[model samples]
Structures are given as C-alpha cells and as structure tokens.
Target chain A: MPLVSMTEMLNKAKAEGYAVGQFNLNNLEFTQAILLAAEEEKSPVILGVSEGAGRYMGGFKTVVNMVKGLMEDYKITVPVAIHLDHGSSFEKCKEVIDAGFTSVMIDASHHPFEENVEVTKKVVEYAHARGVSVEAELGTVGGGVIYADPKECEELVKRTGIDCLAPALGSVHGPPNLGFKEMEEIGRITGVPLVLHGGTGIPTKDIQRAISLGTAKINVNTENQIASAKKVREVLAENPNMYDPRKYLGPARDAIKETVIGKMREFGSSGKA
Target chain B: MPLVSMTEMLNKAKAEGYAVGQFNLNNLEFTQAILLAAEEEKSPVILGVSEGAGRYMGGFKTVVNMVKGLMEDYKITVPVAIHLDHGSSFEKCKEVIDAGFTSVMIDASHHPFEENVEVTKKVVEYAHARGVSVEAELGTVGGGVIYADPKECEELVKRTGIDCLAPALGSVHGPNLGFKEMEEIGRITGVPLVLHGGTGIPTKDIQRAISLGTAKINVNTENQIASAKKVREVLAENPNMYDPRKYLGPARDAIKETVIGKMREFGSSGKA
Candidate 1:
C-alpha cells in the first residue's frame, strides 16, 4: 500500500479548513478504534507513536507492519501516516525511518537552542534523504513534561529545516489547562503546518483558532484513552457482576470512538479522508 | 554464544557473595555502556528492557537482534540474558518470548490479586512451556506503575509458578533514598529468590543485603548514560571542541568502564 504523506494530508486539511486528527496507539484495539472511526467518517488520519509506546508494542517495524496490515485488511481508503510523535534521539528517528515510518518528529527542544537545532537538523538531513517528512519542536509543549516557550519559536524554525513544526504554543500534552498564546505564535512564525500537543483540554473554539493560524495536526492521547478507561471503570463499578470482558470493553471502545469523532468534528476534519 | 539463565547467575552471585548488575537500555549507547562495563569487569550481566524501551527500540524482535549482534561483535564470553524487565501487557510478553528472550517478567502486580494471577499465569504458562524463566511481582516494589502486596506474596507464588519474585519490600524504582526495610522483606520472601529494583541506594547496603537475601538487581535511568554525558559535556564545555564523534564516544566508554567497576564492587564480577 502507498503511504500517505504529511504534505498531502496537511494541504487537504488546509484547503478544507479541517484539521487532521493524529491519534496515538498502544495496541491493536487502539489502532482498530482510530482506523474504524476514520474509515466511517471518511477522514484522513495519522497514527502517532511515542518512544514509550513504540517500545511497548514491539518497536517501529512491528507498528509499521501492523498499520500496513490493517490498511490492507480493512481496505482503508482515507490517507494514513505512521508517525513518530516525539522522538528524543536521532538514532530513534533513524531507526523508525528504516523500519518504515512515513513521518517523524525530532524533539530536541529540551536541549539548549543551538543543541536543539544541531540535533534536529541532523535528523532532518537523514530523514529527508529517505523521503520521510520531519517535524521539529521550537519551544516546549505542556503536559507531564515541561511546556514550550513562545519566545524561542522563531529561532528554532529558522535554524532547523523541518517539514512541520510543533512550537510550544499554549498546547500542553496531558490535560490542557495551559497553552494558548504559544499555540498562536507557532502558527504565525512557521507558515508551514503547525502541530498542537496536549490537545485534549483545549476548547473547540480555541482549536478552530489554532487551525485558522495554520495548525494542521493536533495530537490527542491521554484524554481519549483516559475517558475510555474511566467509562469502563464506571461501568464495572455500576455492575459488579459484569463477567463478560468484551461486554465492558465494548463500551470502552465506543467511548473512545465517540471522543475521537467529537475531536474530528471540532477540528473540522470530518469527511476529509 | 549461549545465553545464561538468571537462576545460574543468581546462584553464582549467592555463592560468591556478589550482586549481578542489570542495566536498563533505551538505545545503542545505553546498551554499549552496560555491556562494555561487563566486559571490562569480566562480570556476568543481564541487559534489562522495560516495555517502553522495547517499543522505542523497535519492539521485541529488534531488541533481541540488536543485543545478539552486540554480543557476537564484541565476542562477549560473559553470560548475558536479554531480560524483559517490566512487561505489563500480555501481547508485549508474548512478543518478547517469541523473539528469543532468555528471561521474561510479567508485571501484573498493578491489578487486583485474582486479576494479577490470571495475567501472570497466562505469561508463566506460555513462557515455561518454551523453557523461558518467568519473574513475577508480589507486592508493590517501588513507586511506579506496578506494585505488589506482601500479604498476597505466598498466594501469588503458589498460583503463578514464577521462577523469581520481586516483592515491594520498600524498594523503589528510581533513586533510592536509603530504605532499610527492603532488605528485611528480601530475607522474608524465601521462595523464588528476590530481585531488587532502584539500586541507587548506598553500595555497602546493597552488597550487604544481597549477601543476606536478594539475588538479582535492576538499575535504570539513574546516571548510567548520564555518567557518559557528564564526560561528554565536560569535554564539549571545555576548549577542546575539535571533533565530537571521536571525543564523545571515548567519554561514553569511560562511563561504561566506571559503571562496570561499580557493579564489580557490588559483587557481580566473574559470575560468567
């Protein structure tokens, strides 16, 4: 199957004014849920894998193969890109590209500015040669990790020739009570597509504003998975006698689907696939 | 070329009164640092890979292949076991075993007693069938994702059929802040031996406790690579900024040697 490029997905999203949903995956169920939703909604999607999830699921190659298999088995029509969400090491980025990832991001923002640039540029050089699109971070994103600084956004973009940029716009990673101005600045400085991390907590209006400012890809992880697990727990609590594992998991899957669909609609990405 | 069993390594450590060091690897440098140290000290070693590290490095097959390659290239005569340190999911454990890991641990301690048993039993059954050793947890060992309960330790052992058990025993995962009770628990859980997590505590205490009870030890994220990075930073920060590739690797090599020395002092020497 032909892999979907970030350029194609982002441009389509820009022309349609709808953002593409980059759903994170840890297992087959998460992949199936996201793909099923994208297939049903006719929206293009990107599968995001963090270093941690990549390790847990067996590595970059296993994930790539799994997604490719699903694409063929499900006859997925909408575009799908397997992406390395926040790769901290250059070796990790290279390994993923070799393992067949279509998109990658080198998150060197944690290092000093020059160091970040050098590291990101190194990744960009290697990734571009292999036809993989590179995403680099400028500032910091919020979440369990530190938040991005808006002042450093422009310098990061100018130094690193990334195909896309995730500036530390007010978008934090975990629950988004922080990150508004940073998101806007990211859109303004990098005329290219911007990515919003920690997108779970942002209001729909703010998300639309981010899109208006050139934020093409938005990442949603903890929110969707947490909500699904929370609902499953609640259902289990409500019915102690629930013996069928699938009976409880069924609701959990739907809950995640509903969350993703809502984000799809909110991002104005519905029906773009 | 033969992978050493954890049981054999621990028994040797027990007889010799030295603790075997198990370093966690997140990347190639991390692996190199750990293995280099083992080679220098002539120590038997176990390379630990958490589920997160396994996925990040490209999954079970990739990790197994990488370690196997390193061992062959280095002509490492010391016994080494590619251990799945803390595997929580069933699929993850299966993939690791299928990929030829010599040692496997099913960290199902986070779930309720029955649930933990169910998940661990599933892993033990499959792993034992393949001649792979199984490590199970009985109380919450550290302040992380998986923890075990002491009261359920005997029950877990009886039900899960684990070859090694890492009880909570007050041993945390990251930096150890001088917890003495961990050793007491180690002495108490007489069945299946004990594997200590968060080995950053005082060396004297670790060596002493290993002598008393615990057999295997796991060290992760605690300045293993940072030791090398420290050397790299010092050189990079200094006036000698000529060639990074040459200088950076040597600095890493120094850290690897230093870590191996520490492990040797901890009594993990010559077990191979």
Candidate 2:
C-alpha cells in the first residue's frame, strides 16, 4: 500500500515460505507492466533499477518519481519496494538511496572479503539509519579475478549486520551447484532471507524448494528481455505500416504482466501480500 | 524545456509557417516514446489524452503525474502540451485541466450551432483564465463532421478565442476540395493549424502543409496498427509468452521511430 523496505518483506517471505520477484525497471512501460502485474496478483514486488538504466532514462530521481506517480495513480495496494539492482560502489548505493529508493544492493562482491564486509557494513549502517534495507553481495568475485568457489555466508553475515545476503555459490548461480545445507546454514547463521540472484529456466520445484530453504527474493530479467526483444523484432517485420506504440506496447505490457504473474505464482508469493 | 501550453508553440508555428505533431497516449510507453521522440528531434510535441484512455491509465491525475515525472526525468526541453483529445464535456475538460493538462480540445461539433458556440465560449473563458489553450472544432454535416474548413475557423476563432484550429475537410478544407485554396484559407484563419487523422496525406503533401502553416499533425492509428500487428505475430510465434512489455515496449519504440520520421518530415525538428 505504501513504500516499504525490502528487509521486512524478505523476513516475511522467509517465514512464510515463499519468494518475492524483483522485476527490474527497463522503461516507463516496464514499470507499468510490473506494478500492474503485482497489483493484479496481490504480490509484494520490487522495482529494480540498474545504474545504466537510470542514466539512460535521465536520472535516478526520474525513475523514482515516475514510480511514485504510477503508484499514486494506480492506487497500488500491494506492498512495493523501489530498489537499486547490483550496485558496486558506495557512491552508487548512496546516489540511488538519496533518489528515494527504499532498498539497495551494494555489490562489493568483486572486492576482497575484508573489503566486501567493510563496504557492506557501511551501506547497511547508512541505509538502516534512513529506514532503507541493504542487500549485500558476498561473491568471491564479480569484476573477475579469482575463479569460482563454493561458499559460506556466515562470517560476512554475522559481521556486516546486513538485511539480505547474495552468497557466492561456486561463483555460478541458478539451477546448478547450489548446496541446500549451505543455504540452511547461512539463513540460520544470518537470520535474514537469502536472495537468489539468477532466474530463468530454473526448475519451478527447485525454486520452491529454494524458498523452503531460506531464499526470499528472486530476480528475473533474461527471460523478460528475450520475450520482449523477440516480439519487437517480429512486430517490426510483419507490420510494415505499424508505428503506434500502443499497438505494440499495450500487448507487450500485457505480456510482461503475464510473466510477472507467472513468476509470482511459481514463487508462491501470490496471495502472500 | 518545462511543461508549456500549446498556445505559444502553435502560434509560433503559424507565424513560421510550420506545424508540429500530436501523439495520443495509449499507455506509459506511448508517453515515453512520444516524449523521447520529441526530445530527440528537438521538436515541439503535444500529448493527446482521450477521456477513455484516461480511465485505462488509472485517471486523468495519474496521466498528468506520469507525464510530469517523465518530463522531469528526461530533462525535456522544447515545448510540450498535455492536451485532452476530443473531450465532450466542460466537466471532462475541467477535470483534466485541474489534473494539470496544459491544453484541451472541446469537440462539440455534435452539439447544435448555438449550443456549440455557447459551450465553447464558456470553455474558452475557463481555460484561458487558467492560461490554457482551447482547441475548438467546426465542420461540414456535423455528424462527427469534418474539422474547420478554411471558412469555418474565422467565426470559431473570433467567437471562441482558441489558440489552434483543426480545419475539417472531408478531404481538404479550402473553397473547392483542393489544396490550392487551403493556403488562402490558411492565411485568412490567421492561426496555427492541426492536420487531423495524420495519414492519407503523403510525406510530400504533409510537408507542403507546413509551408501552408499546418502544425501538430495527428497520427495515432498507424502506430497502433503497426504495434498491434507485431504483437499478434509475436504471440503467435511463441504462444508461451506471458510478458506484455515484450510486445508493448518495442511497439512504443516503433511509434517513437514513426514519430521521429514524422517530425523530420514536418521540419519541426530543428525549430525546438
């Protein structure tokens, strides 16, 4: 009904045994599609903005204001989180948080363990003070120096005092090589819902089970991109006369709604709101 | 740069003998595509919102906020107008105006002649008092009649005090049904112009009107048609698709491309 921090959402999802979907914002239409889908399905959702998307669409303030307008106009009743996706710098997190985002991801995943903990702790402190939730990255590498490795989020989890953790799982995530024992261990150690950073082609059962194990948030964009780009290509080809955005955007928005709805159902977040 | 009324822009185009373009909003992307197209071309643009479309978008207030957010986000320069397209009631126009639309079109051609003038006068008084421009409609047969023909604008303009006029021609608005007299009517009207429906007139023909002082060409059908056709193709190609953004976002971009092409052709590109 009102803007909320993701910390409470993840906790609720974790306890309730479901995962919320974080649909990244691509444009004005994408924003509409995601919010409408969430409202229709009665799901708690996150609007994820990348730094690149923010810059391309003008600025972070623009993204936030546009969302606020949509929420106000739509009279959106479902809980919603305006989040910055995959932020790698303190400045990046700061900028988006200042732009009115209710949540942020500080991706010090590529940094050394000591540095990751340091940066993430700083982010959590700043964000927590301002009523925003901090999603910390714990990858062994992101900028890509060391190869892949299996991991435990325990040390970083206890020390950083973060809200949600994106733990490194052999570096590669989603569908392959996830250790449930580790997830269970991590959640027990940290006491916050674990985040599944990748989505698309992961078996639904696996996703549900991941939920049963402590995963409370899932991010899905690849399939959405594929779905939209393919349609765009197809439309331009068939309708040589086509030009009105509504003709395509209306349908495309409908498609996105369907995807988000499907994700909500699969994540078992439907009616979870 | 900031939101401005259509009054100055249309009058400026009239003085310059060039017309701008109006893109009707279908959804959020339509707003984005059209505004981005205008900014990219550096052309003045009008966002036409019909009353029906307003409900679909949540409300007139929602539409207004969505636009304001984008305008602020995009650092939009150039002139832009948030206009109510074909509003039938003084109340409808009043609501959208209160919602922050910069201008409005009161389509009372369906009303009787005396009533038409009266209502238009009242609307003009209200909108003008708030510094908003009113677009008054006049035409032949009056059955969803053609817009102001060359002769109709004079009375409507004098009586209603509107900023821009859409001269209805079942084909063309001049004395004979040809382009030859349109220029003469164009000068007599002494106001900026609107090219209604936007298609049927070729690129060469549309450009000719700019020289003849036609601005704000209305073309929504073409974009809608193209976008719809593509969605059909895409869903057919992949029945498993669930996301509408797949269809709508691209469709919006297609419209953007279409708007950009029209802006370039309208020659309003560099004027902004």
Candidate 3:
C-alpha cells in the first residue's frame, strides 16, 4: 500500500491505550531497516525526517523518492508514514507535504504561544485540504527542557485542529527525559494523541505509564543511532580488512532493525496494525 | 540525461586514446560517490553490478531505481551506464537488460569455447534488439586466472557482435595480478578491450593498455579498500560517533576521491 497518514493509526493507538513508535529515518540503510522492522513486527510506524536530515539526504524530494522506491521494492504492507520531525516553519511543513510526506510536526514550540498557534493553524489548513495529518507542538519539548503548559496545549490543538500534539513533557532530545499527570491531562484536554519526544533514556516502565495515560506516539532516534553505531564499531573491529559495505553496514542495518522492533514491541504497537 | 550504453563511450575512448572506468556499485553510498566523482571529473562512467552485488542490493529493479533516483535527485548530467559486470548466464544478462540496465557482460568463460560462443551470441542478439549493449568474456578473467586465447577472442567478437571484450590476459579478479598478450589480443580483437583486476596495475601499464585499445577498466577493489579504510579510521578516531552520516559520509568522500583519481589516470577525466 502507499504511505498512509498517521491519523487513523495514532487515533486507534490512543483508543487502544498503545503508542506507536516514530523512528527517525537516518539514511537509505536506516530507512530500509525501519521499514523492514515495522513490517516484520506488524506495527504501524512513522518515519521522522528532521530539517537537518532533509539537507543531509540531498533534499526533500530525494528523501521522498528514496522512501517511495524502497517501499515499493520491499513490498512493505504495514501502515507507514513519512513525517517531518520538528518542522521549524509553516513553509517547511508545506514543503514536506508537497514532497508527499503523510504527516508533519509543525514545531512552532520555540516561538511565542500566539505565533505557534498561528503557524500551526495555517499548516493544518493547508495539510488537511490535501489529506495530510498535522502534528503541533507546545512549549519546549526540545529546550532547557521546559514542560508544556496544559492550558496552552489545549488552546493550540483546539485552535489549529491538528491531528496530534507533542507537548514538551520533560523529555529531552538525547539520552534523557516526561510526567504522567501532565501527559494524561494534555491528552484529555486536547482530545488528541500525545507524542513523547526524547524517548531514548525514558524507562520502559515510564513508557508504559505514558501510554496508559494517553501518550500514543513515541519518537525514538538516539537509541537506534547508538545501536547501529556500536554494531558498526564492533564489526569493523572484528574484520580489519573488510571493506565491503554490505559486510559491515549490513550488520549495522540489522542492529537498527532489531532496536526498532524492540521499540515497537515495547510501545505495545506490535500487531496493532 | 538518461544512462547511455557503454557502446559509444567505450568506442570513443578507444578512438581518443583513453579508458572509461567501470566502478562497481556496492550500495547507495558507493553509487553516489562514483556519480559525484564522474561529474567532478567531467567523465563518463559505468556502474558495474556483479551478480552478487545485484542480489545484495535487493534485485536488479531496485538497483536500477536507486541509480535513476540518485541521478535525478543529484541532477547528474554526465553520461552514465549501469552495466552488469560478470553476469554468469544468458538469462542473467537478459534479466538486467529487461530491468533497464544499459550494458551487460555475459561471462561464459567457464564454459567450453563453443558453449561460450552460443550464449554470448544469444545475449548479443537479445541486447542489441532492445538497443542495449553486450560484453562477452573470452578466457578465465575470473580464475584459474588463465590468459584468454587471442584466437578465441577474435572468433567470439566476430560471431557475437558484442560491444566490447574482456580478454583475460594475465589480469585476475582480485589484488594479486598483465601485457604482451594484452597488446596482441587488442590487435587481434580490433574492438574496444576491457581490463579486469584493474586495482594495483601500474599507471604506466594502464596507459599502455589504453593505447592498445583498452577502453573500459573495471575497478572495484581499490574503491572498496579506500572506503573500508576511511570508515575504519573514522570509527577508530571517534569512538563515540554513532551517526552513520558522520562516518559513512567520509567513506563516501574517500570513494569519490579514489574514482576521481582513477578517471584522471584512465585519461577519462574531462572526456565527458
């Protein structure tokens, strides 16, 4: 099937008290590993493309073509979404949507409350008309790690009509940091799926707790990155003369696949598709 | 532009006293590195996919799409050919050509002389009808590593209508191993010749073979070694680096540098 929007899956996850894994697509191998992991685990997945990743991969169209090509070739049957992670502007979100991303996170969280709502509302209007899903942010999900204000979270979701909300609930980007009361209340007030960023260092118990409290999307990038990097280091160390990329990088891809599969199962997303 | 057959480029190289490098495509990074190198050098290039490489990258169609995607996405304007390096069977050659490969080498060197000729003729006919190009092997360019019989090479090219010929004249498949027979075979075949085991060949000898009609040089090991070494070095230096882009990106640059140097040595630089 073609790439699907995150709407139906995230909504279903929220209803079922499960959270889908949002794995970031790092490169061709990373993309392949994530898609293969999703299919193998029978889980719905979101491919997060950050702004920096967009440039690293040549451009949005390049990443789009690569994803579409791999999906077609790999015969991926599970629900998959290509989502822009932390889109800094309305224009950035529009570019990814035009490039065929099924979902986008309009991360105006760094901006003022009113400014965030305005840009997100504009993006939601443009995205919904095209059947793309919009994810809005509140507070600093990615900062001095400011917790999202539940009041502003409800206002932003209601004003923008976004499909999901990533409320900065104490999770950091790398190896750290969320609160359950704020998480559940935000989901209740906004009546939308809540996303947990910086999912790497969060305890699995807390992750399950977050899911029970209406956190329906968990973004995990650092763990997979770390896994692949460690595996690559091991493989290279073992085989000094090995030059074939498939020899070393292939193992790295498998390591990533394993990590993603574990995350899917841990999030209770496996077999949810 | 879309990928062209190795026909025109190899013939032009034969005519212009140069050799176009046929770099092996190991994966996406390798493909990107080779294409970038070709563009930077303003040279035509061949992406050689061995049978193992074809399977390693999913399938022939997947490889085709990846190359085409990169070409379009990277805005590559230089002439490029996606060629099967050592196709083992007539069916294999036909598979790649049907999968959108522009050039294929039907390596029937393991079979008896008549068997090799029959398969080569069949592939040549099929490939030519579709405007695709065919390359045929004459002796064991692969192993026992025997030199090709110049007489058989003449017969194969005469009977098969192949675009170019890879006659095993002292060049083996890997690091250990060319050239009086190379000159003799070139004069005998009278068509563009290919030099396998291109790694470690002296620069002077490479130019000499080019002057004797070697138009396409198959290079894979050197690029592989360069990438592996760079990746190893990067990972060793940055133990905490887990981002593949930080390391594989440098390995890709190493491949690009190696290809650019190969193009310059082959006299293909600026020939685009």
Q: Estimate, for each residue in B1-272, the C-alpha lDDT of model 3 and write its tens digit.
A: 56999999999999999999999988778888999999889899999999988876767877787787678768888889999998999899988998889999998888899999999999998999987888888778653677688888888988888999998877765673257777877888889999888988889889888978899999999998999999888888887887778988898899999999999999899989
Query: A107-176 in candidate 1: lDDT tens per residue?
Result: 8866878888889889988987877888887556654345566556666767776777776655666563
Q: Assess each model's interface with DockQ, reporting 2 decimals per model.
A: 0.02, 0.31, 0.53
Which clashing pairs does model 3 show?
A171-A177
Q: How well does each candidate superpose onto the true structure, as a TM-score? A: 0.50, 0.83, 0.94
Cα lDDT tens digits for candidate 2, A1-273:
569999888899998889999988877667888999899998999998878777655578778877887898888999999989888888889888888899998878667878887888888888998899888766542214232222436777778888888764433322244566666777776788888766775677777778898889888876666566555556656766665554455566677778889899999889988
Best by DockQ: 3
lDDT of 3 by residue, A95-193 (tens): 889878999999887788888888999999999998899988776765377788899998888888999998887888766336677887888888898
* Regions of model 3 farther than 4 Å from truth: B176-178
Most accurate candidate by TM-score: 3
Clashes of each: 30, 31, 1
Sorting all predicted structures by lDDT, with the top scorer first, yields 3, 2, 1
Scored against the native two-chain complex, candidate 1 gets a DockQ of: 0.02
